[PDB]
Amino acid sequence: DRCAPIKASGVLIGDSVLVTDVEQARSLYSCGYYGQPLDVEKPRGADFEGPLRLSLIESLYLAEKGVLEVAKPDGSSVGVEDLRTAVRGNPRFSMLYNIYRDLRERGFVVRSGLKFGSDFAVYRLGPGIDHAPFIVHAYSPEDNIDPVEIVRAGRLSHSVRKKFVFAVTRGGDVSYLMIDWFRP
């Protein structure tokens, strides 16, 4: 689909970016489900007051796509590349980021997986709308894991949908392992 153009300013404070103008706030939430409102957990679509918090990796993405202008509290501008620094300076964020970019670039709506015990929760249409067919955990292909962890996954995915994905990333490339229970 084709939402609109944009469009939105925020302050960089801590590792996150706040968006305090209410219309921008609802704007972004309604136009791609970006950010998270600081007065409501699970909003009725986009009736909330905000501010809308954006995760640093959300931030860099929106900045990149010329949608978000980030400023520091003193008013001074924060570059795309300033953001690319701050994200590349946090191993978790760093691994996260290329998977987000890829997933958003594939047209999915990407949200925090926290409530399903994983890194990303991934929707076709969006939260409250569809259901999130996919649960993602992020990994460098150099990460070690005990095989039981694979099961733990099939656990996590037990109650929502026995199907979770491993999203592996290096050198800005990404490949995903579909894993679903199976009967020989």
């Binding site: 801590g14 590792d15 996150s16 305090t20 998270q36 501010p51 509290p73 978790r92 925090s112 926290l114």
Partner: protein
């Protein structure tokens, strides 16, 4: 200037080098309140309480209102965005927290118990050990060990974390 904007605030405050200072009280009961619970003592407001009352729109910081004012105190005084959030949440719930004596902790009393909350932020790893010595720590002072995790998006979860020698 021309016309100060005092409509809607229940008080107005300036940001000094170290601290928020209340200069005008427009609702007396409001200030009197902020003195009975100890946040405001002789105009001096405690930085988090000051960021908080900003974010309710009840405290102006000059011509700056609401969250733009919250961000002002917060950045200005060198606070932590997550701690402030867990604070707000806690203020909104009916608690009156103060800064615990340990790094990253908030302390608050309720129902005859004192609660010590450690604020942690996705992306900022910590040794399990530390989690144990902190909880220990906490228990030794007669606080109930609380952990508040704010995920990368701003969501907050609360968990009691009790250290013990043997399960029970």
């Amino acid at each position: 200037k021309g016309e100060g904007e005092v409509a809607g605030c229940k008080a107005a405050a300036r940001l000094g080098v170290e601290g928020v200072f209340v200069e005008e009280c427009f609702d007396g009961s409001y200030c009197r309140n902020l003195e009975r619970i100890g946040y405001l003592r002789k105009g001096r407001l405690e930085p988090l309480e000051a960021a908080y009352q900003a974010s309710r729109g009840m405290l102006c910081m000059g011509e700056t209102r609401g969250w733009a004012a919250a961000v002002e105190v917060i950045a200005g005084l060198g606070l932590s965005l997550d701690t402030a959030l867990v604070y707000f949440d806690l203020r909104r719930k009916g608690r009156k927290p103060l800064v615990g004596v340990r790094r990253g902790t908030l302390v608050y009393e309720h129902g005859g118990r004192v609660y010590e909350v450690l604020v942690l932020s996705e992306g900022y790893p910590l040794k399990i050990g530390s989690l144990v010595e902190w909880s220990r720590g906490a228990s030794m002072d007669n606080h109930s060990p609380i952990v508040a995790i704010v995920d990368r998006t701003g969501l907050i979860t609360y968990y009691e974390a009790r250290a013990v020698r043997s399960i029970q």
